[PDB]
Design a protein around this ligand. Structure first.
Ligand SMILES: *[C@@H]1O[C@H](CO)[C@@H](O)[C@H](O)[C@H]1NC(C)=O
Ligand SMILES: *[C@@H]1O[C@H](CO)[C@@H](O)[C@H](O)[C@H]1NC(C)=O
Lengths: 679, 680
C-alpha cells in the first residue's frame, strides 16, 4: 500500500515556517510593533483558536477515537514530564527549582499542536489517514489538562515560598493551578465543545458552521504570523549554563518526547494491522517533534519566572523543529520504500532543500553585497562561502534535471556541483582560520589572495583529480556516487582536511580569545559579526562531521545497510541546507541589510515639544545631543513607547518632523548608538 | 433548473457580520485596543490580502472570463463615480469640494469585495456558478485602478490648492494620484499576480501553494474581525447636513450602484441563455449591495479629508448592507420560484431572522435587566417592547414548526405570535408617547400602570376580537394570513393606530424639544438614552409603515401581484428583525451593561510615580487631590502615554489596580464616564 503522503510535507513546512518568517520579518522591520502584535495574538487566542477547537470538538465522533493513541501520547508526555520535573527538582538551585520544575516540564511536553502541528498533520495524513487529524485536537487539550496544573502548582509554590505567606495551604496552591488551567481558552473551549458534542448530535447547526469555519480557517495563518511576531527580539544571549539547559529542554521536546511517543504507541496499540500500526507509531514520532508552544512563554511571563530561557527556547525550538520534522518524516517513510524510489526520494529532498536554500542564499548574498560588508573581513570569505553554497544549490537543481540525460554533459554538472560542495567544506576550513587570524593580533594580516585562491582552486583541483582517477557512472541516480569509491575517498579527504583545519583553527582562535582575558562601533560590529561567524563555523563543523562520517561508513562497509541511507539522507540535508544555516545567521543587522509632514508626525512632534522636550533634554542631553539608543531607552522608561519598536518609530517620527536630526544628518533614526541633535 | 443557493446566505451573513460583531465587541471591551488593532490590520492588508489576491490571480483562466460582466460592473461604477463626482463638484462648498469630490465617489463605488463580498458570493454561487467568484478578484482591483486615481487627483488638488504652491502642474498632481493607486497592495499584487499568471502557466508551483493558501484562507476571518475593531468608536454624531450627505452616499453605494450594475449587465451581456443571463444580472445586483471598503476610510485619514463622514459612512454602510443583501438576494430568487415554495421560503426567512434576532433580544434584555435600567423610564416600557419582540421571535420559531401540525393548537401559537406582534406595534406607539411625556415638563408624570396595561392588554384584546371575528385557515402557510382578511384588517388597524399615536407623539415630543430652546450625570444619561429611544421610534416607525402599506395593498387588491410578495417579504423582515434594530441601539453603554499586583501594573505605577505624577497633578488636580477619569484619559492621550481612549482606560485601570489612584468613594472601577478619582 502507498505511504503517508510525504511529498506534501515540504509545501506544508513552507506554509508553516514561511508564514512564521513573514511574521518575523514584519516585526523586525517594525511593520508591526509588539503592541500591535498583541492584537493579532488576542484574535488568535481568544477567537480563532477557541472557534477552531469548538468546531473540531463538536464534529468529533467519540465512538471512533483510537483511545490507545491518546493514552500512549499522553503517557509519553506524562513520563517526559516526570523525568524533566524530577530531574529539575534534584538538580536546580533551591532559590528557583520550583519555578523551573514547573515550567521546564511544560516546555518539554507542550507541543505547538494547533498552529504548526495541524497543518503538517493535515498535509501528511489528510488523504491517507484523516482520523489522525482528530488526535491533534484531542491530545493537545488533554495534555494541558493533565500536565499543566502540575507545573502551575510548582510555580505557585515558588510564589508562595518567595512571598512567605506560610500560613496558606494546599487548597489555595492547587486551586490557583487548576484555575489557570481551566481559564486557558484551550481547556475552556474544549470542555464547552465536548458538552456541545453531546448536546447536539455532532451536527454543527448550519447557522454557526460558517461563522466557526471563518474564525477557525483563519487561525492557521494568523497564529503562524503571530508566532513570527513574538519571535522578533527573543534570542537574547544567555549564560553558558542556560545554553546547556536549553539544549537539554529542547532535546526533551524534540528527541526524547517523540522517541517515547513512538515506543509507547508500540506498547499500547495492540490492534491488528501492521501497516496501520506502523503509520500510527510514525505519526506518534511526528507528533513528538512539534516545537514548544508559545503558550509556555505566555505562562512564563505571567508567572514572571524563567522567562528568558523559556522564550528563547520556544523560539529556538520552533526553528529546530523544522529540519528535524522534515528529516524525521522522510526517515520514517524510508523503511517502507524501495531502493530506486529511495534514491529518487533523496534527490527530491535534495532538490526541495536546495531550491529554497538557494533563495535563502540569494537573500544572504544581497545582504553581504548591499551592506558592502563583502569588502571587509571575514565577510569577504563569507561571501565566498555563500557563493559556494549558492553554486551547490544551483548544481543540485541542475543535477536533479540532468541525472537521466546529457550523459557526457553530466560531467559539467558534476564539476559545478561537487567542486562547489568541496568548496563549501574547504571554505568552512578557510573561514575558521580567518577567524583565528582575526582574533590573533591584527599585525598577522590575512593573505586574502592565497586564501580565496585556495578556497576555490583547491576544490577545482581536487575535482580535476577525481575526474582523472574515477570511473563515470551516470546510471547512479545520486550525484554523491557519480565517481564511486574514488568520489567517496576524495570527499572524505576533503572533509577530513577541512575538519582538521577548522577544528585546529577554532581551537587556536579560542586560545587567542583566552589570551584576550562611529568607526569604533563599526569595528566592534565587525568583531560581533566575527562571533556570529564562530557560530556559523560551529554549526558547519557539525555538518562537516555528518558528511565525513557517512563517507567513512560507506568506505568501511561497501555493502551499505539501512543506517547508511539514514546517513546519506542526513548528508543531503546538511550539504544543501547549510544555506539555510547561513541565512539564519546573516539575517540579523536590518539597517546594514536594507539602508545602504503628516498630521501624525505633527502630533508626535507637538506631544514632545509641548511636554516632554525639556524633561528629556534634562535627562539625556550633554555637551544639544543624545544617542538614539538612549532616547529609545528613555521613551521606553518614560512610557511614551511600549517597546524598542515603538521607540524607534517615535524617533523616526520626531526625525521626520524635525524635532531632531542626526549630528551630520547622514543617517536616519536608529537604535545603533548613533548620535542625534535637537533643532 | 435550480436557483442560486439562497439558503446558504444567512449562514454566510452570520460568518461575515458575526465575525464583525466579534471584532466590534472585542474592541469595545478593550480586549484589543486601536494600537493593538493595527497589527491585525497590517497582517490583513500587507500579507493575507496580497497573498489571497496573488493566488487567485495566478490561478485565473483569462480565456474563460466573461469580460462583459467586468465591463458592465466597471461601467456601472464609472457612471456612479461620474454622477457622484459631478454632483459633488456642483453642490459642495468651494473650501472642500475637491476633497469631497475625490472621496465621496470612491465611497459610492469601492465595495468591500474581499472581506464581505467574497464569503457571500462563495456561499451563494460556489456550487451553482463557480466562475462568478473570479469576478470579485477581477472587478475590485480593476475598479481601484480606474476609479481611485480620479478621486485621488481631486484630493491632491485639495492639497495643492490649500497649500498654494501654485507653480506646480498636472504632472505632480496626477503622478501622486497614480502613485497612491500603484502603491496600494491590491493594485500592486494584482499586477504582480497577473504577470505571474503568464510567467507560470497558471500553476501555482506547489511549493508556495500551501503558503499562499495559509495566508489567503486567514484573510477572511481576520479582515472581518479587523473591520469590527475599526468600527468601535466610529459612529460619531454629525451635523444634520452630514447626515443627509451620508444617506445620499450610502444610497449611492447600496441602492443606485446595484441597480446600475443590473441594468448594465442586461445591456452588455448579449449571451444566449436566459437562466444564465438572469443569474449574471442577479449577481450584478448582489455585487452592488456590498458595503463601502474600510480602505476608503484609510484613504480619508491619509489625506486627512472628510474623515468623519467617510469613517461613519463606511461603518453605517457595513451595518446597512447586511439587511439589504439578505432582502435583495431573496427578492431576486422569488421571481424564479413557485408560490407554495415561496410561502415556505418566506417562512424560512422569518425563521432565520427570528432565531438570531431572538438571541439579539435575549442579549438586549440582559442589558436592560442587569443595568437595572428596566426600573427607570422610558426603559421600563422599552423592556416591554423588547419582551414583545422576544415573544414575537419565539412565536415565529414556534409557528415555523407548528404550521403543519396541532391544527387546533395553532390557535395558541397564533395568539402568542400575533398578540405579541400587535404588541410591538402598539408599544412603538406607547414608547413614543412616553418620550413625549418625558420631554414635556416632568410634572406631567407618566401613568405607568395604564400604559403597560394597554401595551399588553390592547393587543391581547385585539387578538381576542380577531379570534371572534375571523375564520380559521391553518392550511395557510404564513401566520400572516391565518385569519385572512379579518387578520389583515385588524393588523392594518393596529398599525394605523400605532402610526398615528407614534407620529403625533413624536411630533409633540419634537415640539417640547423646540420649546426647550453623579445623579446629574445619571439623569443626563437617561435623557441621552431617551434620545437613542427617539432613534428607535423613528426606525420602528419606518417598519410600521412598511407593514401597514403591505396590509393596505393586499386589502385594496385582494388578487395580489408580485409586488405584494415583495412587500410581504419585507414585512416579515421588519416584523422579526426589529429585534436586531433594538439590539443595535441598546448595545452601547458597556459599563452599564457589564459591571452592575502584576509586574506590568507595578511598571505602570512606577512610570507614573517616578515621572509623570507631579506634572499630571499640576495639569488636572483641583480642590474639588482629585480628578475626573475622562480628564486623566484626555491627558494620557494628549501626553502620549496612551494612544487612544482605549489604552487610556487600560492605563487608568492599571494605575487603579496598582493603587496610584482610586475612585473618590472607591465604589467604582476606572471609567471614562466623568466619574471622579483621587491619588493616594
Ligand atoms: C487502516 O486505515 C484505513 C484508513 O482509515 C482503514 O480504511 C482501514 O480499515 C485500516 N486498517 C486496519 C487494519 O486497521
Ligand atoms: C450556464 O453556464 C454553465 C457553466 O458555464 C454552462 O455549463 C451552461 O451551458 C450555461 N447554460 C446556459 C443556458 O447558458
Amino acid at each position: 500500500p502507498p505511504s503517508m503522503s510525504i511529498t506534501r510535507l515540504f509545501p506544508a513546512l513552507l506554509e508553516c515556517f514561511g508564514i512564521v518568517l513573514c511574521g518575523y520579518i514584519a516585526g523586525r522591520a517594525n511593520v508591526i510593533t509588539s503592541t500591535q502584535a498583541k492584537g493579532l495574538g488576542n484574535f488568535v487566542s481568544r477567537f480563532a483558536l477557541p472557534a477552531l477547537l469548538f468546531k473540531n470538538m463538536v464534529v468529533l465522533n467519540f465512538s471512533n477515537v483510537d483511545w490507545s493513541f491518546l493514552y500512549s501520547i499522553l503517557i509519553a508526555k506524562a513520563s517526559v514530564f516526570f523525568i524533566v520535573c524530577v530531574l529539575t527538582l534534584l538538580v536546580a538551585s533551591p532559590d528557583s527549582r520550583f519555578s523551573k520544575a514547573g515550567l521546564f516540564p511544560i516546555f518539554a511536553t507542550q507541543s505547538n499542536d494547533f498552529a504548526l502541528g495541524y497543518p503538517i498533520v493535515e498535509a501528511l495524513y489528510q488523504t491517507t489517514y484523516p482520523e489522525y487529524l482528530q488526535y491533534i485536537y484531542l491530545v493537545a487539550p488533554i495534555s494541558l489538562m493533565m500536565l499543566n496544573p502540575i507545573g502551575f502548582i510548582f510555580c505557585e509554590i515558588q510564589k508562595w515560598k518567595d512571598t512567605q505567606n506560610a500560613s496558606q495551604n494546599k487548597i489555595k496552591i492547587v486551586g490557583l493551578g487548576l484555575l489557570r488551567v481551566l481559564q486557558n481558552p484551550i481547556v475552556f473551549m474544549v470542555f464547552i465543545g465536548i458538552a456541545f458534542n453531546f448536546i447536539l448530535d455532532r451536527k454543527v447547526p448550519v447557522y454557526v458552521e460558517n461563522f466557526l469555519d471563518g474564525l477557525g480557517n483563519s487561525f492557521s495563518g494568523s497564529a503562524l504570523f503571530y508566532l513570527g511576531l513574538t519571535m522578533v527580539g527573543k534570542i537574547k544571549r544567555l549564560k553558558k549554563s542556560a545554553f546547556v539547559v536549553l539544549i537539554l529542554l529542547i532535546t526533551a521536546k524534540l528527541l526524547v518526547l517523540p522517541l517515547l511517543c513512538r515506543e509507547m504507541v508500540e506498547l499500547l496499540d495492540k490492534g491488528d494491522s501492521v501497516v496501520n500500526h506502523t503509520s500510527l507509531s510514525n505519526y506518534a514520532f511526528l507528533y513528538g517533534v512539534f516545537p514548544v508552544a508559545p503558550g509556555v512563554a505566555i505562562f512564563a511571563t505571567q508567572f514572571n519566572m524563567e522567562v528568558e530561557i523559556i522564550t528563547s527556547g520556544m523560539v529556538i525550538s520552533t526553528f529546530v523543529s523544522a529540519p528535524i520534522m522534515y528529516v524525521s518524516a522522510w526517515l520514517l517513510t524510508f523503511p517502507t520504500m524501495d531502493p530506486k524510489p529511495l534514491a529518487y526520494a533523496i534527490q527530491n529532498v535534495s532538490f526541495d532543500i536546495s531550491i529554497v536554500s538557494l533563495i535563502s542564499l540569494i537573500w544572504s548574498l544581497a545582504i553581504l553585497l548591499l551592506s558592502k560588508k563583502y569588502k571587509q573581513l571575514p565577510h569577504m570569505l563569507t561571501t565566498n562561502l555563500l557563493i559556494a553554497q549558492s553554486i551547490v544549490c544551483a548544481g543540485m537543481m541542475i543535477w536533479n534535471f540532468v541525472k537521466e540525460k546529457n550523459f557526457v554533459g553530466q560531467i559539467l554538472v558534476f564539476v559545478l556541483l561537487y567542486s562547489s560542495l568541496y568548496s563549501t567544506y574547504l571554505w568552512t576550513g578557510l573561514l575558521a582560520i580567518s577567524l583565528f587570524l582575526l582574533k590573533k593580533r591584527e599585525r598577522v594580516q590575512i593573505p586574502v589572495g592565497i586564501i580565496i585562491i585556495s578556497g576555490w582552486g583547491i576544490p577545482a583541483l581536487l575535482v580535476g583529480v577525481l575526474l582523472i582517477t574515477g570511473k563515470h557512472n551516470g546510471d547512479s541516480i545520486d550525484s554523491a556516487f557519480f565517481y564511486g569509491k574514488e568520489q567517496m575517498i576524495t570527499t572524505a579527504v576533503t572533509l577530513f582536511c577541512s575538519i582538521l583545519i577548522a577544528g585546529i583553527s577554532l581551537m587556536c582562535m579560542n586560545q587567542t580569545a583566552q589570551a584576550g582575558s562611529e568607526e569604533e562601533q563599526y569595528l566592534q560590529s565587525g568583531d560581533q559579526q566575527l562571533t556570529r561567524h564562530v557560530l556559523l563555523c560551529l554549526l558547519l563543523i557539525i555538518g562537516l562531521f555528518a558528511n565525513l562520517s557517512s563517507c567513512l561508513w560507506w568506505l568501511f562497509n561497501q555493502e551499505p545497510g539501512r543506517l547508511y541511507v539514514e546517513l546519506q539522507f542526513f548528508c543531503a540535508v546538511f550539504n544543501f541546507g547549510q544555506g539555510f544555516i547561513s541565512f539564519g545567521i546573516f539575517g540579523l543587522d536590518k539597517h546594514l541589510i536594507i539602508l545602504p509632514v503628516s498630521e501624525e508626525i505633527k502630533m508626535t512632534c507637538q506631544q514632545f515639544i509641548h511636554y516632554h522636550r525639556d524633561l528629556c533634554i534634562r535627562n539625556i542631553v550633554k555637551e544639544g545631543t543624545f544617542c538614539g539608543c538612549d532616547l529609545v531607552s528613555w521613551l521606553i522608561e518614560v512610557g511614551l513607547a511600549s517597546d524598542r519598536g515603538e521607540a524607534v518609530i517615535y524617533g523616526d517620527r520626531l526625525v521626520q518632523g524635525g524635532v531632531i536630526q542626526h549630528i551630520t544628518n547622514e543617517y536616519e533614526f536608529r537604535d545603533e548608538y548613533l548620535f542625534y541633535r535637537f533643532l
